[PDB]
């Protein structure tokens, strides 16, 4: 049974500098086009016709302000294929209509599929359990919820995040003003998972590094480890006593410790994704009804919650006309919300 | 009165807050960086109005 | 009736009880404001 | 305040049901032969 399929299989799995695999057929072109689209757009391509913004090095933007911006709102959720009815095979017009945005979003999505398939394929060849791919499910849930489902729930791709540093910052602030996203318990669980994950990373690294066995003569202690050694390189018993006495509880089981290091940031990201699916539909955690009833009836009742809402109102009114140009907003000065003096 | 403009902000559960909206509120702008321990107040009622708990904590 | 050979005992150790209770209680402390609305 | 009237029982059962689940499993683990 040595046919062309098995010969190709042989070639794909050669132990070379950069592993290819069957998954590589999907992963490499898609990742390359996604990165290339971004670099190409941020270097050369405008957002004048879609947003009324300069967005490239060519126009005078810097690394923080370049972006590949979303298509105009009038495009709706068009796949905006180069050979599609909008661009009609015209490359220049396609760039001007925002086709690079969907090019990057879609190729990027298939690329992420490719990467997770790669994690599976390599795990299988080497003979380890596939927890790395499993953990990668969280980046996938995030990308899919934020870059696809969220704008699919809204009016058009226009309201997806645009691919750029400052553009992303704008996405954050928009979510605050319009969605009150910081109030959302799903976002909050996300925050707990990210910061808790960072905390675990730091504390675990530092603990290992500070309960090392002296396994060599050098004052720089990195050389006193050998990959093939059977022995733990640090003392779990000392680590355990230290933390039990410092913080009251400590890990005692290394397998549980490492699983927990998977569980915390992965679960956090998954929760954030769920909340974003809600925001796709404007199904927000925007208000507490009891708060609003009390506040509406009682002009002396004030909390940090009501204060934050006044900030959000400011954001919406002052950012909307330029951020949502298709609405043709004209807000006369006299209607703009402002406190005293400012 | 966090901002020293006689506009008291409610932070506690018993005064209309939930876990999400609740806070111990920063000390008054009228105070600035002045040290405001309990014994600098004429009374606990004053201490409380001006945000003394914040500094203590 | 003959016994089923697929039966297995179940366990939850004390640490897992504590972690579980912390999860549920913290989840409640978090979501309760929204339940009261 | 005009809170949602189901919030109290929602919260109580939210806590009670899974906690009781865990307590049941814990105690019967302990009672198994040492």
């Amino acid at each position: 049974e040595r046919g062309w399929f098995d010969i190709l299989d042989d070639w794909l799995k050669r132990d070379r500098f950069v592993f290819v695999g069957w998954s590589g057929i999907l992963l490499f072109p898609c990742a390359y086009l996604a990165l290339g689209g971004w670099l190409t757009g941020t270097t050369f391509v405008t957002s004048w016709y879609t947003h009324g913004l300069a967005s490239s090095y060519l126009e005078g933007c810097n690394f923080l302000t370049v972006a590949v911006s979303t298509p105009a709102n009038s495009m709706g959720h068009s796949l905006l294929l180069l050979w599609g009815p909008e661009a009609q095979g015209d490359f220049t017009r396609w760039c001007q209509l925002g086709g690079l945005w969907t090019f990057i979003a879609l190729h990027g999505a298939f690329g992420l599929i490719g990467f997770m398939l790669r994690q599976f394929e390599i795990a299988r060849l080497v003979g380890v359990r596939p927890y790395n791919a499993i953990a990668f499910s969280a980046p996938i849930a995030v990308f899919v919820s934020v870059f696809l489902i969220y704008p699919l729930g809204q009016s058009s791709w226009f309201f997806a995040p645009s691919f750029g540093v400052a553009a992303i910052f704008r996405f954050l602030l928009f979510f605050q003003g319009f969605h009150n996203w910081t109030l959302n318990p799903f976002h909050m669980m996300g925050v707990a998972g990210v910061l808790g994950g960072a905390l675990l990373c730091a504390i675990h690294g530092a603990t290992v590094e500070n309960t090392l066995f002296q396994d060599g003569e050098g004052a720089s202690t990195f050389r006193a480890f050998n990959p093939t050694q059977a022995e733990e390189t640090y003392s779990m018993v000392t680590a355990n006593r230290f933390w039990s006495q410092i913080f009251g509880i400590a890990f005692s089981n290394k397998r549980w410790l490492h699983f927990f290091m998977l569980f915390v940031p992965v679960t956090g990201l998954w929760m954030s994704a769920i909340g974003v699916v809600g925001l796709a539909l404007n199904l927000r955690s925007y208000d507490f009804i009891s708060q609003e009833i009390r506040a509406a009836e009682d002009p002396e009742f004030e909390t940090f919650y009501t204060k934050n809402l006044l900030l959000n109102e400011g954001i919406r009114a002052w950012m909307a006309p330029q951020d949502q140009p298709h609405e043709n907003f004209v807000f006369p000065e006299e209607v703009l919300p402002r406190g005293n003096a400012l | 009165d966090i901002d020293g403009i006689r506009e008291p902000v409610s932070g506690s559960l018993l005064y209309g807050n939930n876990i999400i909206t609740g806070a111990v509120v920063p000390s008054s702008n009228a105070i600035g960086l002045h040290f405001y321990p309990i014994w600098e107040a004429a009374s606990l009622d004053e201490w409380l109005y001006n945000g003394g708990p914040y500094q203590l904590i | 009736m003959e016994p089923n050979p697929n039966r297995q005992p179940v366990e939850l150790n004390r640490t897992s009880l504590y972690l579980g209770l912390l999860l549920i209680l913290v989840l409640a402390l978090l979501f309760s404001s929204y339940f009261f609305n | 305040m005009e809170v949602n009237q189901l919030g109290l029982i929602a919260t109580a059962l939210f806590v009670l049901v899974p906690s009781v689940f865990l307590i049941i499993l814990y105690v019967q683990t302990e009672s198994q032969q040492k």
Binding site: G248, I249 | - | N13, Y18, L22, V26, L29 | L8, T11
Partner: peptide, 30 residues
């Protein structure tokens, strides 16, 4: 009723801290 609920959950948590620290299963070197 709300405030009682919040404070109660909090109190249960502090109690849990107490049991988890002082009445933990002791770690044993096998």
């Amino acid at each position: 009723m709300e405030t009682i609920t919040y404070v109660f959950i909090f109190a249960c948590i502090i109690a849990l801290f107490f049991f988890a620290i002082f009445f933990r299963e002791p770690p044993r070197i096998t």
